[PDB]
């Protein structure tokens, strides 16, 4: 286990045996792919192979090393104000819980229909000094599940978190990180969906009727400062203890908007990664 | 234990067995609620149920995960002064030990008549820079039980704490936290009370005759600085190792003042959460 | 207490590390995990399923479907050539393929590979193509003889319909790079007529062949990296 796990030799690939010639009836190279199945032909079948003892692990080819990597999924921003502190909808951020709001990683999952996981979660606040001294800028992140009082503005009554989670980070002390159970009323997170809100010819349809899972109302606790700032707290996410069901063809068209598939670009012709050739004859 | 405790499957709910029809005498659906007791009827009784093996824990429905969550119960503030340092009743805070001084969490307990617990306790100082440089602002929190010399002003003789508790926090070093035994001369903390100070038709009556448990006189040790500041040290509280006796109906009227029940708003009609319907016939 | 020394790396953050974190939401017992038909556990699996190949990688064709078919024609001449593509699995036409699309998530690849072709011809129709794998070393062959000299498979179109061509693994370095590299050049594969396409009366004289590529149990990848085949020259709105 150790060795196999430390040496990373858990999932090893078979070796390529030796072959000889075959002047025989059964032709393994011939199958009818229309059966929708996949061929089973190998080196040893087609050629006069040798003998290679392999030693490549398919460890890094596991839904956990494919998925289990932290990725920017949101960049909370706060261009503070000292003029009006508090006021409605200010100096505090709130953002709807999701992934589709930012590619590369959105891409990655979407490779599967259903998914399930405990999520890591890390916050990377970066304090840009627009003043001659930033002081001590404390911070409060927290999580507002449904249906819950989402701060109208900066000091509601909801920042008491008498029964909510609020993580606090003060300049110097390291990056806040924490983790989370798999939050869904369903046995798995719906990466997709072919359902709607209802029969209302104006109902919602997508990944989304099934994912109202939160939001995040933010706060820079410290009170009024002299010299201004702007805070940019980056939100990274990692999938630990993941499972996946029914793979899908990757995405080749740059999306737009989340919780939707829509590609149809604003005017520009739909572009894809495929390159053009002069002729099939020369590559 | 582990698994059951790590998997959080300690308190599991029964499953819904299968039923068949009943053309029989005893009618479980009929009971007389006047007995003050509660009915005992189930799915299986009323319908022709199926068979569902459950898997929901009532773990998070425990007086410890209901109560055991940190909540703002006080926000100590100090608008420093450099003009007059010391002086009487300045630059040092003191505040009467309690909870009813701030909702959401006050709400939460009040759900029970009696309560008992060891309390966590955490301090979240936030230093607002009103100057061009905050220096090194050290801090001293401490606790003044009855009857004890409560600092008249900033440097008494009581800040020697020769036999008292004073926690010290210096800008950078993390949030001060500590915990505490259950402090009451009584076997439990009285969330309520129907008693008085005495027969004096001017005696006190409430939660309160039974809770003079302290106060907190504060201090910013550092001496005189140049560039001003304002400190806001937030006081969060968590209940660990809690017990509760005789549940009560929750509160629906926004209170006012602590150690009292009084709702009677200043003029405004007494408002409650109930919504109005046009008709009972349509919901 | 424990006289400790804080090591260099301490306090950092890596998008690639295995560490625990206090779980907010203590005491939460997640929805049970019901049974669901078809769950993956390894990219590999997906890599072993043959996905179709864009090969008619030509001009107007490209944004359409045709971009997938290869019509086997007339051919006045004889011993003439059909097409060619190069093996470097991250190279349009390959790339976009379930495999390619993937491989482009890792820095290095290895093992054998499988190319399969199918005759969307007729029943009464007949043909015989010669497919070949020209290992890395020289130039994609200009002529059949020259190409027949290396690895190949004669394909007899018949009641079967699908011929699968294997691409042995020939390389110096146990491993090849997924990224375009003159060194790690995997070679070319090409197809030519062995005989012709003969059709008895009143049958069309052009027909198509679809082509595919799935992996071999040989196969394996490594060094995960972010993809090539997708630039989010967005953002993404709401």
């Amino acid at each position: 286990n150790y060795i196999d796990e430390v040496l990373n030799e858990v999932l090893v690939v078979p070796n390529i045996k030796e072959s000889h010639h075959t002047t025989s009836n059964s032709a393994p190279l011939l199958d009818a792919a229309e059966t929708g199945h996949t061929s089973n032909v190998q080196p040893e079948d087609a050629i006069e192979t040798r003998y290679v003892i392999t030693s490549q692990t398919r460890d890094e080819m596991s839904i956990e090393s494919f998925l289990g990597r932290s990725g920017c999924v949101h960049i909370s921003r706060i261009k503070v104000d000292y003029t009006d502190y508090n006021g409605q909808d200010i100096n505090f951020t709130k953002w709807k819980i999701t992934l589709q709001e930012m590619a590369q990683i959105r891409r990655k999952f979407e490779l599967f229909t259903y998914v399930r996981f405990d999520s890591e979660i890390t916050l990377v606040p970066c304090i840009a000094g627009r003043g001659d001294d930033i002081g001590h800028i404390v911070m409060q992140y927290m999580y507002v599940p449904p249906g819950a009082p989402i701060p109208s503005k900066r000091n509601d009554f909801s920042w008491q978190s008498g029964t909510n989670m609020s993580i606090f980070w003060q300049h110097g002390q390291p990056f806040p990180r924490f983790s989370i159970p798999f939050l869904s009323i369903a046995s798995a997170y719906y990466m997709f969906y072919d359902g709607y809100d209802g029969d209302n010819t104006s109902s919602k349809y997508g990944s989304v009727v099934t994912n109202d899972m939160g939001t995040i109302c933010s706060r820079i606790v410290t009170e009024k400062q002299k010299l201004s700032v702007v805070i940019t707290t980056h939100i990274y996410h990692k999938a630990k203890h993941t499972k996946a069901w029914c793979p899908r063809p990757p995405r080749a068209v740059p999306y737009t908007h989340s919780h939707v598939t829509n590609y149809m670009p604003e005017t520009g012709d739909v572009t894809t990664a495929i390159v053009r050739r002069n002729t099939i004859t020369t590559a | 234990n582990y698994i059951d405790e790590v998997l959080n499957e300690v308190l599991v709910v029964p499953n819904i067995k299968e039923s068949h029809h009943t053309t029989s005498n005893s009618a479980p659906l009929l009971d007389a609620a006047e007995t003050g007791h509660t009915s005992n009827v189930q799915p299986e009784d009323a319908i022709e149920t199926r068979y569902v093996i459950t898997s929901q824990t009532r773990d998070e429905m425990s007086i410890e995960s209901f109560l055991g969550r940190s909540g703002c119960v006080h926000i100590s503030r100090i608008k420093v002064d450099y003009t007059d340092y010391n002086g009487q009743d300045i630059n040092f805070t003191k505040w009467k030990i309690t909870l009813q001084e701030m909702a959401q969490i006050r709400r939460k307990f009040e759900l029970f008549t009696y309560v008992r617990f060891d309390s966590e306790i955490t301090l979240v100082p936030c230093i607002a820079g009103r100057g061009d440089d905050i220096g090194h602002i050290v801090m001293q929190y401490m606790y003044v039980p009855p009857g004890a010399p409560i600092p008249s002003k900033r440097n008494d003789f009581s800040w020697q704490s020769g036999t008292n508790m004073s926690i010290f926090w210096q800008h950078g070093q993390p949030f001060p936290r500590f915990s505490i035994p259950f402090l009451s001369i009584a076997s439990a903390y009285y969330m309520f009370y129907d008693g008085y100070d005495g027969d004096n038709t001017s005696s006190k009556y409430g939660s309160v005759v039974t809770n003079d448990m302290g106060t907190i006189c504060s201090r910013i040790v550092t001496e005189k600085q140049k560039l001003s500041v304002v400190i806001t040290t937030h006081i969060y509280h968590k209940a660990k190792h809690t017990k509760a006796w005789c549940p009560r109906p929750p509160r629906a009227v926004p209170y006012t003042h602590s150690h009292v029940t009084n709702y009677m708003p200043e003029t405004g009609d007494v408002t409650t959460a109930i919504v109005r319907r046009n008709t009972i016939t349509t919901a | 207490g424990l006289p400790v020394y804080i090591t260099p790396g301490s306090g950092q953050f890596m998008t690639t590390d295995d560490m625990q974190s206090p779980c907010a939401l203590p005491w939460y017992h997640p929805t049970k995990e019901i049974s669901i038909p078809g769950e993956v556990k390894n990219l590999i699996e997906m890599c072993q399923v043959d996905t179709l190949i864009p090969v008619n990688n030509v001009g107007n064709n490209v944004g359409n479907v045709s971009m997938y078919t290869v019509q086997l024609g007339n051919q006045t001449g004889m011993a003439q050539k059909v097409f060619s593509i190069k093996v470097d699995i991250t190279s349009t036409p390959l790339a976009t393929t379930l495999i390619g699309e993937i491989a482009s998530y890792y820095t290095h690849w290895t093992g054998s590979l499988r190319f399969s072709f199918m005759f969307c011809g007729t029943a009464n129709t007949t043909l015989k193509l010669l497919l070949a794998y020209t290992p890395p070393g020289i130039d994609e062959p200009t002529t059949r003889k020259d190409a027949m000299l290396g690895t190949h498979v004669v394909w007899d179109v018949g009641l079967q319909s699908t011929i699968s061509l294997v691409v042995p693994w020939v390389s110096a370095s146990h491993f090849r790079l997924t990224a375009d590299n003159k060194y790690s050049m995997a070679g070319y594969i090409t197809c030519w007529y062995q005989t012709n396409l003969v059709v008895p009366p009143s049958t069309p004289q052009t027909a198509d062949m679809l082509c595919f590529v799935s992996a071999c149990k040989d196969f394996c990848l490594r060094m995960a990296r972010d993809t090539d085949l997708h630039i989010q020259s967005g953002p993404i709105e709401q």
């Binding site: 405990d118 630990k240 | 405790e5 998997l7 | 625990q20 779980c23 939401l25 203590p26």
Partner: peptide, 19 residues
């Protein structure tokens, strides 16, 4: 060094294993 789930909950733990 391992299996020392310093934290109570299971959701908090390292990347799972392989089998």
């Amino acid at each position: 060094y391992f299996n020392i789930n310093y934290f109570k909950d299971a959701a908090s733990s390292g990347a799972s294993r392989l089998d």
